[PDB]
Design an enzyme around this catalytic site. Structure first.
Site, short mmCIF file in Angstrom:
data_model
loop_
_atom_site.label_atom_id
_atom_site.label_comp_id
_atom_site.label_asym_id
_atom_site.label_seq_id
_atom_site.Cartn_x
_atom_site.Cartn_y
_atom_site.Cartn_z
N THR B 44 12.05 13.41 -9.35
CA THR B 44 11.57 13.18 -10.75
C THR B 44 11.75 14.59 -11.45
O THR B 44 12.54 14.72 -12.68
CB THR B 44 10.13 12.51 -10.84
N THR B 45 11.22 15.52 -11.07
CA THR B 45 11.12 16.77 -11.42
C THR B 45 12.57 17.47 -11.30
O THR B 45 13.02 18.54 -12.04
CB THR B 45 10.31 17.71 -10.74
N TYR B 107 9.33 0.57 -14.74
CA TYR B 107 9.55 -0.47 -15.59
C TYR B 107 9.81 -1.92 -15.61
O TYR B 107 9.27 -2.60 -16.32
CB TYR B 107 10.94 0.17 -16.36
N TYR B 133 6.32 6.82 -2.70
CA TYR B 133 6.03 7.69 -3.70
C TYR B 133 5.16 6.81 -4.76
O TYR B 133 5.91 6.21 -5.59
CB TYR B 133 7.51 8.22 -4.29
N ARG B 138 3.64 6.79 -14.19
CA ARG B 138 4.89 6.71 -14.42
C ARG B 138 5.59 5.16 -14.33
O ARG B 138 6.20 4.90 -15.19
CB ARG B 138 6.01 7.74 -13.43
N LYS B 162 3.35 10.01 -0.88
CA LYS B 162 3.06 11.17 -1.84
C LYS B 162 2.42 10.44 -2.77
O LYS B 162 3.02 9.45 -3.41
CB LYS B 162 4.35 11.32 -2.53
N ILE B 204 3.56 17.53 -2.33
CA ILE B 204 5.01 17.73 -2.96
C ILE B 204 4.49 17.96 -4.58
O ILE B 204 3.83 17.08 -5.13
CB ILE B 204 5.82 16.40 -2.97
#
Lengths: 295, 294, 295, 304
Positions: B44-45, B107, B133, B138, B162, B204
């Site tokens: 994501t980052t 989503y 994750y 999100r 994570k 992380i």
């Protein structure tokens, strides 16, 4: 010195008819001290403060002080969403000989941050006793910010601590910044008391301590010693209990657990129920066996 | 293998928005030099949502090449489309990644059974270790410890999580459902401290992009059981953890790195290359507090 | 016929010293009736029930009944998170001559659905008056399900309606299924009273009606007539006011608005504040001008 | 006959299905079934069409499949009702590509979701929608859905977009907060096209000033949904409530589990449609969910 370790949020035992059971309450407090509890909170949320009369609230505070006999600090529940009532409850506890006050954020009426400041300021000015702010958004909806908390700490010398039930451990770090490293932070969540102390907490005002005072005391002792590996071992032993007693209201889970281990009465006052679901009771039974409190 | 301070690596861009491969390589090399214990490329980052498949693949390959087996490369292989997740997983395996980081589908809001099916399909398709994750902030959906436990039992290569729930009791619940050997890594910089107290073995980390040495030393302290020292690191790093996330973490991080290392602030829309003055001031103050700027 | 239309959740005016201003209350009630309000709720949340003593609660209910003079129904606030207290408050209101009772879900102590059933059942059995359930998760955290609500309606003939402050309009449709089409549903949210009635609601227990009783009454009348185009015109006129009075607590937004239009005292009881932010007051000013209540 | 609006400009209203994308057993796009569904939707009274939105499983379609289904929808519609093509992405560049394809293919408008997963700021939202709006001449409907995207476009941001771009014409509002319709009337104007993004509250939504619904339930009950919307347009809210009584059990049942799956089950019962979906959606439902859908279909008069 005063505010540290495992501090039970004491239940208020009732007889079958719903009356306060002074004998059972005294016996519970005696046992708590004997097993290693580092302080006492009478007539808080878990002591069913919402359903006690002013006279009952007063008597249980007095009885707790009498039974404790200065062995451990008595931190009296003095909460209300009515500032005048909070002051009235606070002043009594001071006169009765309480060592400190636990003061909840106003629930239901949803004040602003400035309203929170005014509420806690008025209580702090009315008494000389040390005050622990009880911030519990899951119950009160409103949430005292670190900024508001810091402002109160700066303005009043007798606002000395927080019982933090946000469940947001970064808040401990933010409160260290706004209120200082010396500000007393106590966990308001049994299941995260471990991480809470890692972030700078120095104890927990605890529901689980009602059921497992020795284990909870040793758990807190391990963290004070900096022995977090041992603390995690206690978390392994206690987590099933922490989870099980809160499947339904903590008061009711706790009173069930104590009914099994110590023959305590399950009676609570409406709208709390004296009964639980079978899956809850099964989980509590399994948790008690896991903790070694039952066979 | 998977432990300590593991940066969720940014993907640097040039002014025109193209992937800056040389800036990425230098960033990874510096991260290893400063003590980072693993690497997550194109998560994501790393702006995975705005990278093409070709760009995703290239950056994963570069990360593997630059790392040169010094620390594990845990490749971002997330998608809300199971077929796509498998494709990304297979590429990363073929490229020589050490593990895969696989996000819960965002989503489309699958059920717990849908989550089970998604992760099972990915796990069956590859031999590499998989780190789930779980990030409800999100993805909205939240993999329960019971679903997670079922996946761990069903697939030997589902090895860790994570955990970005921010609910530290979940670490304790995951110890119960998944076992004490299940690898739990914090997905939240600000609570990495409490996370390891509950049984976590690393983080992380977004903040590691900016302060890799301090983050590595912080994690090292916790591994050594020196939680008093760890708290001292938290005192030093918390302002940075907070400031980086006032606005999106990618943008907070790239601003911080623009000040300390001359990194480009460029991001791809809908992320912004700019920040509010108050955010920049807070990041500046946090960098000074951490000893990274005068 | 009883419970319908625009029903103000009446403020309780205070003098500068914080004492109940009985004269100002009487004038407010008289004006409300003159302007077209279809019912009255004294001593609810917006009447600052949390900070009123039992005696004050009692007096204001009695006062409201006397001023009303049977012109419109008096639906007395009788809420508590303590079942015994709710019963006591309900019994007084009945004795005083109230036409109905508004009973909030217990706040703060977070009962189960079964606890909610027990609480409302106990109140219903204690009194003969019709009861309106006040379901407000934004304040009480707990949320009475359509299933629990339907069970209460079936069990007690005098549980007749809901003040629904969920803000989830699909709940009106679900409540029609579980409680029946004849179950009285009243909006607990001013800003969505429009959609609420479209879904089957028949009125609103309203904060905004304190400030704009005529506009609110005409708004509700339009919906009763099925003239939703006209109702939307009223929404255009009133929405800025609905929003502005709730930027900070509704009690305080309302008392500021009334200070500008009617010379009402802004005094509230702590933890509510007698002051507002400049931006809030500016927004209320603009909303009053938009509504035609100020020049 | 063709759609005309006596503002020749630019009319999106009524019951607009968020069209499912049928698959064959193997998971391939079933073009035959899709075309038949579109044809039936138009015959039953649907007032517009949204191909390859969320309910059309946009997340699991390839670019080629996305394009093909959009083109197929335009082809089959044959200008009878407006085609509002799904053109959503959390990547602005991708959204632009999808927008341009839909324009060139002959779509009448775009439905553009707020970026999900990457959580942009309000200024990021403005930049995203501004870039899409500047790239095309097509009318754009903003799809604000905090339950999926987490971020929430404020009325202020929305109003700013409306002022800046004449082709930003409406919102599919899935906030479920009906006061937002009122706030959007203030910030965007009374002429701003507001369409409900929630079937269960489409009734209240229009009472607040909405003019239609982009609808999942319309896949199953297009005639009843169209008549429901027509009643509200005529100001007959008593009749509209009768439709709500008839349709609410279906609105609830199809969303007990994901709406795509509830809908495909319902259509498997009424019309023999394939239940196949693409992972992470499941081709199966819980028995209680299916029973609830069955009961809802019977209540609505769609099954015996």
């Amino acid at each position: 010195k005063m505010f540290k370790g495992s501090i039970p949020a004491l239940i208020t035992p009732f007889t079958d008819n719903g009356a306060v059971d002074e004998q059972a309450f005294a016996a519970h407090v005696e046992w708590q001290i004997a097993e290693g509890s580092n302080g006492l909170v009478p007539v808080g949320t878990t002591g069913e403060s919402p359903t006690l009369s002013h006279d009952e609230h007063k008597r249980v505070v007095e009885l707790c002080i009498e039974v404790a006999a200065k062995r451990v600090p008595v931190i009296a529940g003095a909460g209300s969403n009515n500032t005048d009532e909070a002051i009235e409850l606070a002043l009594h506890a001071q006169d009765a000989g309480a060592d400190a006050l636990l003061v909840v954020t106003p629930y239901y009426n949803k004040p602003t941050q400035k309203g929170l400041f005014a509420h806690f300021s008025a209580v702090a000015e009315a008494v000389k006793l040390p005050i622990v702010i009880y911030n519990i958004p899951p119950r009160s909806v409103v949430d005292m910010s670190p900024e508001t908390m810091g402002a109160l700490v700066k303005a009043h010398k007798n606002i000395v601590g927080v019982k933090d039930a946000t469940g947001k451990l970064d808040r401990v770090s933010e409160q260290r910044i706004s209120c200082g490293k010396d500000f007393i932070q106590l966990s308001g969540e049994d299941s995260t008391a471990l991480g809470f102390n890692a972030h700078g907490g120095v104890g927990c005002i605890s529901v689980s301590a009602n059921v497992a005072p020795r284990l909870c005391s040793e758990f807190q002792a391990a963290m004070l010693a900096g022995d977090y590996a041992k603390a995690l071992e206690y978390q392994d032993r206690l987590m099933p209990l922490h989870r099980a007693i809160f499947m339904e209201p903590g008061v009711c889970g706790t009173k069930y657990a104590l009914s099994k281990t110590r023959g305590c009465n399950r009676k609570v006052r409406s709208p709390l129920m004296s009964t639980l679901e079978p899956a809850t009771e099964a989980a509590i039974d399994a948790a008690l066996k896991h903790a070694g409190l039952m066979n």
